[PDB]
């Protein structure tokens, strides 16, 4: 039920016109966090969404990752957060999918990466190749 609830909330984005409502992003994040026991399933669902969705939903998909990781780090502690480490496994592939967004959305992705870097959400060994991937598209 926890994962089913999260999946329903996440996939409801495809019925919406971005930018996505703060309240909707909060509901998605809250569902993810309540389902922390099943964090692996939550990560897998978000990655699947990003792989399969229309280009208009790539930035929203990244905002889901960002919102989950930020809330988890706040709520459980940066060292105890299980979400950023799990997202890190497939992150290179995830961003390859994300960069299939419309051209003027690339900057929105880089902004998120810039903020992750400033706040040490991932180490440079993760952040730098993601940044390099943005630079290579141009
Ligand atoms: N966590
Ligand atoms: N945690």
Report resolution in angstroms.
1.9
Q: Which residues line ligand 2 (CB under 6 A)?
A: 76, 80-82
Give the residue, by CA position, lying nearest to ligand 1 atom 1.
81
Phi (first) and psi of residue 16, to 5 degrees: -120, 155
Contact 101, 59 (CB under 8 A): yes
Instruction: Enter the tokens of residue 31.
Output: 């569902």
Contacts of 28 (CB under 8 A, 6+ apart): 6, 9, 10, 13, 64, 67, 68
Q: CATH number of the domain at 1-138, out of 3.40.50.300, 1.25.40.90, 3.90.1150.10, 1.10.10.1800?
A: 1.25.40.90
Residues enclosing ligand 1, CB less than 6 A? 36, 72, 76, 80-83
Task: List CB contacts of 50: < 8 A, sequence separation 6 or more.
Answer: 58, 61, 62, 94, 97, 98
Distance between Cα 99 and ligand 2 center (Å):
29
How far is Cα 40 from Cα 25, in angstroms, rounded to an integer? 19
Expt. technique: X-ray
Domain ranges of the chain: 1-138
> How far is ligand 1, taken at its centre, from the CA of residue 136, in Å?
33
CA-closest candidate to residue 98, choices 133, 73, 70: 133
CB-based contacts of 4: which residues, under 8 Å, 6+ apart? Answer: none
């Amino acid at each position: 039920e926890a994962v089913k609830t999260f999946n329903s909330e996440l996939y409801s984005l495809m019925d919406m016109k971005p930018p996505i409502s703060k309240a909707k992003m909060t509901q998605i994040t809250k569902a993810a966090i309540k389902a922390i026991k099943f964090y692996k399933h939550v990560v897998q669902s978000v990655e699947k969404f990003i792989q399969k969705c229309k280009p208009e939903y790539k930035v929203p998909g990244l905002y889901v990752i960002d919102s989950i990781v930020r809330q988890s780090r706040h709520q459980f502690g940066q060292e105890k957060d299980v979400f950023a480490p799990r997202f890190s496994n497939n992150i290179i592939s995830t961003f390859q999918n994300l960069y299939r967004c419309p051209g003027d959305d690339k900057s929105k992705i880089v902004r998120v990466l810039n903020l992750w870097q400033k706040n040490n959400v991932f180490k440079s060994e993760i952040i730098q190749p993601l940044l390099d991937m943005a630079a290579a598209l141009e």
